[PDB]
Design an enzyme around this catalytic site. Structure first.
Site, PDB file in Angstrom:
ATOM      1  N   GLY A  44       0.411   5.793   0.857  1.00 36.57           N
ATOM      2  CA  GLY A  44      -0.402   6.823   1.498  1.00 36.57           C
ATOM      3  C   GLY A  44       0.460   7.850   2.189  1.00 36.57           C
ATOM      4  N   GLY A  45      -0.118   8.563   3.160  1.00 31.61           N
ATOM      5  CA  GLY A  45       0.634   9.554   3.960  1.00 31.61           C
ATOM      6  C   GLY A  45       1.885   9.000   4.637  1.00 31.61           C
ATOM      7  N   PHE A  46       1.874   7.702   4.915  1.00 32.35           N
ATOM      8  CA  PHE A  46       3.037   6.953   5.439  1.00 32.35           C
ATOM      9  C   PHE A  46       4.159   6.578   4.426  1.00 32.35           C
ATOM     10  CE2 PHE A  46       1.393   3.103   3.509  1.00 32.35           C
ATOM     11  CZ  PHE A  46       0.017   3.255   3.550  1.00 32.35           C
ATOM     12  N   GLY A  47       3.958   6.836   3.136  1.00 33.35           N
ATOM     13  CA  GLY A  47       4.931   6.463   2.099  1.00 33.35           C
ATOM     14  C   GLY A  47       4.452   5.247   1.317  1.00 33.35           C
ATOM     15  N   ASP A  83      -5.558  -6.224   7.923  1.00 34.08           N
ATOM     16  CA  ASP A  83      -5.762  -5.052   8.751  1.00 34.08           C
ATOM     17  C   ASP A  83      -7.209  -5.026   9.253  1.00 34.08           C
ATOM     18  OD1 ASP A  83      -7.321  -2.796   7.231  1.00 34.08           O
ATOM     19  OD2 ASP A  83      -5.884  -3.585   5.789  1.00 34.08           O
ATOM     20  N   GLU A 109       8.595  -5.751  10.808  1.00 35.33           N
ATOM     21  CA  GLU A 109       7.987  -7.074  10.875  1.00 35.33           C
ATOM     22  C   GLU A 109       6.787  -7.160   9.954  1.00 35.33           C
ATOM     23  OE1 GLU A 109       7.215  -7.323  15.217  1.00 35.33           O
ATOM     24  OE2 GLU A 109       8.518  -9.103  15.096  1.00 35.33           O
ATOM     25  N   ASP A 164      -2.606   8.267  16.236  1.00 35.43           N
ATOM     26  CA  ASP A 164      -3.391   7.856  15.059  1.00 35.43           C
ATOM     27  C   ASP A 164      -3.907   6.433  15.239  1.00 35.43           C
ATOM     28  OD1 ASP A 164      -4.654   8.476  12.601  1.00 35.43           O
ATOM     29  OD2 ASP A 164      -2.902   7.822  11.416  1.00 35.43           O
ATOM     30  N   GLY A 180       0.819  -1.219   0.000  1.00 32.09           N
ATOM     31  CA  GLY A 180       0.000   0.000   0.000  1.00 32.09           C
ATOM     32  C   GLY A 180       0.845   1.256   0.000  1.00 32.09           C
TER      33      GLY A 180
HETATM   34 CL1  LIG Z   1       1.855  -6.456   6.215  1.00 27.50          CL
HETATM   35  C1  LIG Z   1       2.463  -4.913   6.849  1.00 27.50           C
HETATM   36  C2  LIG Z   1       3.597  -4.897   7.852  1.00 27.50           C
HETATM   37  C3  LIG Z   1       4.022  -3.756   8.321  1.00 27.50           C
HETATM   38  C4  LIG Z   1       3.357  -2.487   7.849  1.00 27.50           C
HETATM   39  C5  LIG Z   1       2.368  -2.485   6.976  1.00 27.50           C
HETATM   40  C6  LIG Z   1       1.885  -3.819   6.434  1.00 27.50           C
HETATM   41  N1  LIG Z   1       1.750  -1.257   6.558  1.00 27.50           N
HETATM   42  C7  LIG Z   1       0.656  -1.236   5.572  1.00 27.50           C
HETATM   43  C8  LIG Z   1      -0.753  -1.096   6.134  1.00 27.50           C
HETATM   44  C9  LIG Z   1      -1.814  -1.386   5.053  1.00 27.50           C
HETATM   45  C10 LIG Z   1      -3.207  -1.106   5.625  1.00 27.50           C
HETATM   46  C11 LIG Z   1      -4.276  -1.425   4.582  1.00 27.50           C
HETATM   47  N2  LIG Z   1      -4.093  -0.681   3.349  1.00 27.50           N
HETATM   48  C12 LIG Z   1      -2.770  -0.857   2.755  1.00 27.50           C
HETATM   49  C13 LIG Z   1      -1.661  -0.539   3.776  1.00 27.50           C
HETATM   50  C14 LIG Z   1       2.277  -0.054   7.141  1.00 27.50           C
HETATM   51  C15 LIG Z   1       1.699   1.321   6.806  1.00 27.50           C
HETATM   52  C16 LIG Z   1       2.219   2.401   7.366  1.00 27.50           C
HETATM   53  C17 LIG Z   1       3.358   2.310   8.361  1.00 27.50           C
HETATM   54  C18 LIG Z   1       3.839   1.131   8.670  1.00 27.50           C
HETATM   55  C19 LIG Z   1       3.267  -0.104   8.011  1.00 27.50           C
HETATM   56  O1  LIG Z   1       3.882  -1.306   8.400  1.00 27.50           O
END
Ligand SMILES: Clc1ccc2c(c1)N(CCC1CCNCC1)c1ccccc1O2
EC number: 2.7.11.1
Length: 273
Positions: free
Chosen positions: A15-18, A96, A89, A135, A13
């Site tokens: 978004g605002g997180f990169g 989610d 991890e 958040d 994915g």
């Molecule tokens: Cl499997 C997995 C492990 C570690 C992850 C993440 C995923 N993500 C992605 C989250 C999804 C939510 C549904 N829509 C798409 C993004 C993450 C997103 C933002 C910061 C840290 C993240 O750290």
């Protein structure tokens, strides 16, 4: 050495997180998540034990990644010329909580109780490590579907926890408390409790209680789904308009609705397998 040490899979994915990719650590075969953020999109900076310039997100993650918990851990990070890359991890299989609730709708109270309890334990862990998430919401919670374990993500809007007022916020508006809406002021813990009330409503009703600013400020909670009296009371307490009328974490976890929580593994056997 990021390229040789990790094999990159699909985009999970952005978004605002990169941008976050699925990945594997080549050394073992540890599933990981690889998160890229452009340097120009980082307003919030901090400093390490030795003291290089890093995103605040890296500082916050290091503080909470020591030992086990309900937080997705930072395993490593890399600096590139125009970006930072974080290795996190990745549980497998995983979903989610936003997607989970979208698919199944309102959660049975037994399942909401187990999930909510694990969220509380994870947030207490952050607060004990000196970190305020800012958040907390369904999209920032991952479910390890086999173990029934919940894990917090996305510290990109977070801060060092302090006892004085916060006057900045970059989390999700519909989980933000009325004191932020009206005054642009909040304290860490009591704002976190408000967002936990929103999350709990979301879990047991299948949607958030407030869309508009005026509804947040009004703070009247209407239940669209059948919810036990004890659960309505906990939700309404977390969503008290006055910050000082909200429960502490201890009071939430001693609430009658919160007794006899299932273990994570039991939760998976009953509800997730
Ligand atoms: Cl499997 C997995 C492990 C570690 C992850 C993440 C995923 N993500 C992605 C989250 C999804 C939510 C549904 N829509 C798409 C993004 C993450 C997103 C933002 C910061 C840290 C993240 O750290």
């Amino acid at each position: 050495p990021l390229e040789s040490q990790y094999q990159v899979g699909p985009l999970l994915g952005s978004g605002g997180f990169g941008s976050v990719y699925s990945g594997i650590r080549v050394s073992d075969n540890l599933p990981v998540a690889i998160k890229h953020v452009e340097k120009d999109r980082i307003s919030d900076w901090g400093e390490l034990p030795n003291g290089t310039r890093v995103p605040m997100e890296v500082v916050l993650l290091k503080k909470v990644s020591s030992g086990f918990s309900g937080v997705i851990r930072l395993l490593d990070w890399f600096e590139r010329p125009d970006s930072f890359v974080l290795i996190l991890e990745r549980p497998e299989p995983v979903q989610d909580l936003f997607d989970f609730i979208t698919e199944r709708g309102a959660l049975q109270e037994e399942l909401a109780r187990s999930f909510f309890w694990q969220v509380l334990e994870a947030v207490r862990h952050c607060h004990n490590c000196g970190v305020l998430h800012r958040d907390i919401k369904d999209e920032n919670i991952l479910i390890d579907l086999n173990r029934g374990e919940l894990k917090l993500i996305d510290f990109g809007s977070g801060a060092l926890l302090k006892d004085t007022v916060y006057t900045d916020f970059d989390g999700t508006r519909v989980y933000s408390p009325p004191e932020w809406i009206r005054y642009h002021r909040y304290h860490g813990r009591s704002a976190a409790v408000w967002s936990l009330g929103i999350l709990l409503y979301d879990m047991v009703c299948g949607d958030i209680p407030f869309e508009h600013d005026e509804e947040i400020i009004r703070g009247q909670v209407f239940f669209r789904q059948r919810v036990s009296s004890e659960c309505q009371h906990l939700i309404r307490w977390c969503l008290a308009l006055r910050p000082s009328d909200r429960p502490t974490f201890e009071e939430i976890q001693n609430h009658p609705w919160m007794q006899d929580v299932l273990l994570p593994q039991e939760t998976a056997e009953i509800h997730l397998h």
